[PDB]
Design a protein around this nucleic acid. Sequence first.
RNA 1: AAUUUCUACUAAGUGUAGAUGGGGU
Length: 1121
Amino acid sequence: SKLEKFTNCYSLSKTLRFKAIPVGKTQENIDNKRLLVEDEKRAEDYKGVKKLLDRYYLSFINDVLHSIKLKNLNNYISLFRKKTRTEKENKELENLEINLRKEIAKAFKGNEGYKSLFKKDIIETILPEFLDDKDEIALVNSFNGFTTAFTGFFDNRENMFSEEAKSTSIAFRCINENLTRYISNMDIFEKVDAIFDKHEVQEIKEKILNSDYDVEDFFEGEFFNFVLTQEGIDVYNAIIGGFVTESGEKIKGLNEYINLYNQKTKQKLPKFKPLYKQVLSDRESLSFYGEGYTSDEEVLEVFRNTLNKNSEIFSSIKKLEKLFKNFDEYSSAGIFVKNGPAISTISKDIFGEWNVIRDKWNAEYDDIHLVTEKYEDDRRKSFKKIGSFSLEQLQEYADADLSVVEKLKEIIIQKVDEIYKVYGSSEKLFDADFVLEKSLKKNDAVVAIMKDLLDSVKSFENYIKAFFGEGKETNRDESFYGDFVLAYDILLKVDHIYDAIRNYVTQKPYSKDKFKLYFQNPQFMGGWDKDKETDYRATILRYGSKYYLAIMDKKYAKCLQKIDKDDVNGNYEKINYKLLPYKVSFESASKKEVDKLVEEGKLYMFQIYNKDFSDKSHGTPNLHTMYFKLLFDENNHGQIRLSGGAELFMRRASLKKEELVVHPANSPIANKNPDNPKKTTTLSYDVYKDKRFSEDQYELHIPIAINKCPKNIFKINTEVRVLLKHDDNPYVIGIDRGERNLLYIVVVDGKGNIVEQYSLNEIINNFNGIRIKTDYHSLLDKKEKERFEARQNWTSIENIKELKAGYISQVVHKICELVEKYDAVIALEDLNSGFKNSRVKVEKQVYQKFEKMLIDKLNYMVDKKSNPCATGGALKGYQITNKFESFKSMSTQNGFIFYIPAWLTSKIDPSTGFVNLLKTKYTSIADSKKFISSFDRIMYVPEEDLFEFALDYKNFSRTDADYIKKWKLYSYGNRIRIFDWEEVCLTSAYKELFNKYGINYQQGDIRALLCEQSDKAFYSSFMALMSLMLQMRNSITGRTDVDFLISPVKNSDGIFYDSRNYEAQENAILPKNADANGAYNIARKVLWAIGQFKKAEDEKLDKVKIAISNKEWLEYAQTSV
RNA sequence: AAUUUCUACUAAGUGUAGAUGGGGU
């Protein structure tokens, strides 16, 4: 078995969360001794103390830099963009810059206690000394011994600034994007001195700190000399950003001065942009990061009401793009446009089709470099190398009088028009006394209003983002860039406010906020060492079927160890974990004495509880529940062991029993699964909505660690390759999405014969023998019908995403069993390549999550029902996958998950192999005549009313991919022309096309007459009917059941493949539908790969490209069948 | 419409079928 090999490979750890319920008098005892209000108090002061800690971190940035500020290595970064050195703009920049990130590191790094500021010591001594306010000092010392709480904050705020740039460091907005706004400062002032006079420059030169007596380092050109990270970033922005004197004197910086020339006398006045500084407080992450949003009226939206910054800059960007026309006179080339995902949309918006830009550039590439297979990839990579497409360069890839610039201007202006349209519909929410009616999460009208405006602005942001380029260019129009970039900086503010309100409304009715329970002990539950039972003061107890958590406290931290054996009692077995957090002994302790302690105030026993610990629990337990019981089982011999550090938190009541939705006792309870025969239930009791969140839970997040001692450690990919070579029959699960099925699975064997083809739209949940199915596809449809109304409210999309994530969890199970029963490599798609968009099913994001959860599941692949110690069982999960690295590491193979490009796997005939490799779109009469002419022989075969189109695929364009190169295209059978559909019979329509135009089809080879036709519209319909002939997947938009494939070519037995012939059959041998074909050939593209492993050498099975190009495909697809 | 938590549920009557690494910014 191929799967069996992969066990005990790596070692992941996990955290089985659970709940604990205060058994005995624990709750009252905790309350008597106020054992948890200090944990609560600290957790309400976390933020407060974080701010104080950050003040010391900001003084570190200040003082250290203030003194050590000479830009060490590169003089004062004088050679920054001076004259090109060895290698133009290559080493010239790169090296100078990287010595730059160390110029800053050295300053900090080894100072007066880097580790005295970034470890426990700060809040204990250094921070109290830094402060002086009694309240603040006491707050900081109340958060002492308790720095194991600020650990994450420490690391974040320390490792973000080192000898690197980018990321979120000082160098970034310290030497990288800081010097872009700097640089023109201490040399050839020149251009910027248009004004800069006695009433201007001299006035401000006396106002600023007289260390910089004159302006010197302020405007000019070439190199710079001041600020760095800290000297007062505001010092540079005193004239560059403007610093109005408190007295009243209007000091207008130095750039805030140009505006008297930059815009008043009109120009671009050499940039001079406001210096960037440390993100948020100290180089954090987002500068707009804020909290709040806890109540329905917590802030009436910072957007025009409580966020006027945003509203201001939509107008600013709008004016800047309305100045695009005079920026043509300035520097149209200077404005760039990032090549990427936006470039296709840009093409459509400006020119008309999504591929104008691409193809125009590809044509120019052909002029200078030449299509074939490898030439496609040459063009591809080189287009990916381009990162900006100047505006005038895009005008060259134009059409006619189409002005790329002006078309962009118009489209992007109408984008803000959309914003303002919804700003007029949100006036109610923006009015001072907004009458809040039914909450906010229940006020779907308000949700919609919010969403609409928030997303209108968000869309403009993403559209105008591109008008940036790659930043690192040359002739950047400085009348555009600079002014535009300032406004855009703010229009990035919306992102946060959108997220805030979205996440408020999409919020659950309850809350899962917890506070770490230290119980007056910073070292609480941090281990399970037998020898140290009084250090962390915690042990897992066991009352036979129940599981507990004993936690002794301060003045009685060793009580249990004295009074153990209760002999003839129930004995809450103390854990005798003699191994390190498998020696899972369980010392039978006390019962009467354990409970005695709980009632007194000594112990604080809690109960570990999952729904599968009830006596009323009827069926299969959860996997985590299983793992938990298995930690303390005899079977676990070192698989799932303890990791140490149970984080007991405390989730309070977010809801109250009285305001929950009840299903009164003895009243028939309607069942909501359409496929439930036993509709209605009538329960003897009541059932409330979310009763666990209406009470107080004590979340015990027990860390556990799977396979910490791996025996069979090997590289997974190479071992998969070896296994997929020595096998006689490599089955491939083959998973494609699809429109009719959500995740159609076509298991295909080692010869390409369909073994199974079932849509996983229905999950047949098997409980007590009875298999009640759930049409997740129909559920999706009903959820999408809810989405249809109220403009896809935020919650409806969340519900779809969550149902799709719960579906994903369900397909993960099914695929796991499919893989297990067939020993089959999945054949998922490399999602970093091309794009399936037709699928009205699992999307890219959800399939990426699917394959992440397949490689997270495939790390410890476990089916619940299987016996724990058998393969596939709880402690023998298959490690057939890798370990999720990134979403871009999902590109080749991650074990039993070959990511194959999904190119032409669905629109290919599964019987012959024919792929339409020919563009059959009527361009001009001549194009189709050459098309018609390149056919070997077009005859009407009246025998079987057909129109044979013998063709040479070696005599065509972009067709090097093919293999047979000689196909006869008989117009036969029925096509569904989706224009919204018509079922056009091919032969009949062609007979009638030829009858109408006078083309006597009854003339043997009539190709000459077809090319003879002088009517333009003849070929139009001719080429469109030819397109239909070649179209294989044919399905009526909507009606599920007409999913058929139809070949224009006959096979070796003369039959034209029909999917509808096979859809009637249960054991079909060829795809029974369109999406089945897809999964069939995705399991066949992986099949080319498997053949490649038996065609490549064993020791060489590692670099065998599994990347199947379309030329080794369309060969095999046209030759094995 | 019950849940360690999530999704679908009622699924044989206080539950069921799957999945579930979480902890700090």
